[PDB]
Amino acid sequence: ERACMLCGIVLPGRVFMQNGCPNCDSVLNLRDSDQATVNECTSSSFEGLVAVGDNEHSWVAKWLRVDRFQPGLYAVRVDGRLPSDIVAALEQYGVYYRPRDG
């Protein structure tokens, strides 16, 4: 299992390779990446497992800034940060990265 650094979702790593991140892949494009890319945008190290069943009405989800995302498992803390080159590319897309590492 790995955690997406952008949205915090927790999925089996191969999922990040097979389908991309279900919240983020419009900008992250992990589906069409190599393993080095997936491992730079997702972390094997994370803490605080959160079942979010109702994103849009959960206060827990709003605090973690996952209220606009899909129901699923999320992490309170994701270790590592997105590589500066990917942060720069996301910013070109109007996406603002707020690190989830604390």
Partner 1 sequence: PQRLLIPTVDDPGIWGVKVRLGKEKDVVRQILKKKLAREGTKNPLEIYSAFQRDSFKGHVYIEARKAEAINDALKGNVNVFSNNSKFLVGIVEYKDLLRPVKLTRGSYVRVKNGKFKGDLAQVDEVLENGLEARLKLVPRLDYGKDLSYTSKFRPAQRLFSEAEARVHEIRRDRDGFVTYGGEEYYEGFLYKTFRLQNLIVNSINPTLNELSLF
Binding-site members are 4, 7, 21, 24
Listed in sequence order, the DSSP H helices in the chain are: 13-18, 25-28, 35-41, 59-63, 84-92
Report if residue 21 touches Zn ion, rule: CB under 5 A. Answer: yes
Task: Name which of partner 1, Zn ion, none residue 6 binds, using a CB cut-off of 5 to 8 Å depending on partner kind.
Answer: Zn ion
100 binds partner 1 (CB under 8 A): yes
Rg (CA), the chain: 13
Q: Between 69 and 88, how does the x/- string for binding to partner 1 read (CB under 8 A)? A: --xxx--xx--xx-x-----
Q: Three-class SS of residue 99?
A: coil
